Ligand binder design. Structure first.
Ligand SMILES: C=C1CN=c2nc(N)[nH]c(=O)c2=N1
Ligand SMILES: C=C1CN=c2nc(N)[nH]c(=O)c2=N1
Ligand SMILES: Nc1ccc(C(=O)O)cc1
Ligand SMILES: Nc1ccc(C(=O)O)cc1
Ligand SMILES: [Mg+2]
Ligand SMILES: [Mg+2]
Lengths: 275, 276
């Protein structure tokens, strides 16, 4: 009932908020905001103060149409941030990356969790993650960020997601990553149209059958934007609503831009579930 | 599913947002704000633009420890606002009142719904409501605003609420108000402690067994305040979270101060519910 890494524990009996720290110039909602060290550190402290129990550090945007980032570039964006945070704060450090080198160097810098939207499918990533001994989040995606929003299609969405997770859990275990080190994310917005996203949100509780923690990320995405017809920074309410729905179905970790609001909503959820 | 009055159709297949217009000096979160005509009309416009499909007008705060308000004082606060709103906007008007004179005179002025927190129990209120033919919302409360929060107690909370509703549905039907014109509100914060409120919220879907629309009011209340430790105006997120939880369980009407936020949240709720 707790996740663990390097002496840290995380309470999975109540919703946990993961604060998003983009260290990119081009992230869809906040590129260029926390792009440098003192600003990143400031934003992380703000999220911690607002009640985040994990900080997700990402140096590669993976939005629809996102450009490629070189190994060295991603390393330069990510590892000094991990290092500075690891030295200052008692909090879970998640690294949103798919690269083997970033996985390894971030682990050396003191990271706790590998958040890979590509589920360790890049060359060397599976072996690199294995050697870290750290927990790993596997995420469902149809296609790649360059083409995932070109005609998304499913015979049955939940069936595909289940098969994907079953296949990749097996890969991880065979590579020496214990099943209990794994987290599952059905990947909202990743090769899924508006209907798919809400179908998934409506059916989210079905994914508990794997008996692994669920992590979800809907914050400021087009699944909110397309319904409300508002820019990313004005999607806080819609994003919080999605968080509440997900958490009411027992999703354990919520990945968000707007930590304070999400934390406040999770309090209400927690009080409702425990009654 | 489908409610109508005065030739206007309230779709209840999707969550509806009721916007709060307090015409009082002492309401718990906003007393004195929209306390005069021009500003009442101003505030109602803003709620309409934000997507509210009902405007709830209330001239008597009923917060824990609220003072009584004279009949003449209530009529003066409420009826000129109802009048101006009916003569100006194409929307459902709700009156949050318990007084027979206020019921009658508000209906005369063009109201669409009687929102009574005392469930027509005041002398002459039941008869006055009958004579209008208008839909009535019946709310559960233990005690009275003056004492309701002095040791709220229930053997079983949901059982009591059901029994309360069964009895007052019967009172209304007998007096000539047809069942299909009734709405039920379990009355969050009315003679209920923190535990009771969240028990009620967790079990809200059980009340669908009456096959009557549910209205709920949690906006900015102490059930949010006690958890978040922020003042009434900072309770928007907590209030929206309660609204989402309620609407996911199929509650049809959500009574709120912050309309824009609630409407956006309801859009997300609607997209989720209709995705089988
Ligand atoms: C935009 C992003 C970037 N990284 C993510 N990581 C996870 N695990 N889940 C997401 O939904 C997600 N969205
Ligand atoms: C504070 C108030 C004033 N009027 C209300 N009316 C209804 N129907 N429900 C409420 O929760 C409510 N709370
Ligand atoms: N990485 C992603 C960023 C944003 C979205 C989205 O807005 O749907 C999807 C994926
Ligand atoms: N009329 C009411 C006003 C406020 C509250 C509350 O804050 O719980 C309850 C009733
Ligand atoms: Mg990112
Ligand atoms: Mg009031």
């Amino acid at each position: 009932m707790h996740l663990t890494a390097r002496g840290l524990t995380l309470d999975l009996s109540r919703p946990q908020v993961m604060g998003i720290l983009n260290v990119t110039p081009d992230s869809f909602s906040d590129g260029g905001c926390h792009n440098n060290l003192d600003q990143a550190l400031q934003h992380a402290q703000r999220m911690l103060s607002a009640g985040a129990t994990l900080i997700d550090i990402g140096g590669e945007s993976t939005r629809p149409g996102a450009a490629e980032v070189s190994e060295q570039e991603e390393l330069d964006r990510v590892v000094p941030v991990v290092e500075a945070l690891a030295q200052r704060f008692d909090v879970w450090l998640s690294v949103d990356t798919s690269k083997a080198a970033v996985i390894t160097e971030s682990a050396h810098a003191g990271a706790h969790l590998i958040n890979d939207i590509r589920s360790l499918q890049e060359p060397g990533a599976l072996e690199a993650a294995a050697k870290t001994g750290l927990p790993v989040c596997l995420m469902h995606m149809q296609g790649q960020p360059k083409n995932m929003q070109h005609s998304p299609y499913y015979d049955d969405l939940m069936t595909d997601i289940n098969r994907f997770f079953q296949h990749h859990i097996e890969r991880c275990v065979a590579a020496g990553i214990a099943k209990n080190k794994l987290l599952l994310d059905p990947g909202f917005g990743f090769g899924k149209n508006l209907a798919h996203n809400y179908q998934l949100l409506a059916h989210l509780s079905e994914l508990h059958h794997f008996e692994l923690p669920l992590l979800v990320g809907m914050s400021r995405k087009s699944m909110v934007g397309q319904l409300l017809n508002v820019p990313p920074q004005q999607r806080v309410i819609g994003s919080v609503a999605c968080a509440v729905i997900a958490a009411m179905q027992g999703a354990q970790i919520i990945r968000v831009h707007d930590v304070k609001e999400t934390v406040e909503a999770m309090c209400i959820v927690e009080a409702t579930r425990s009654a």
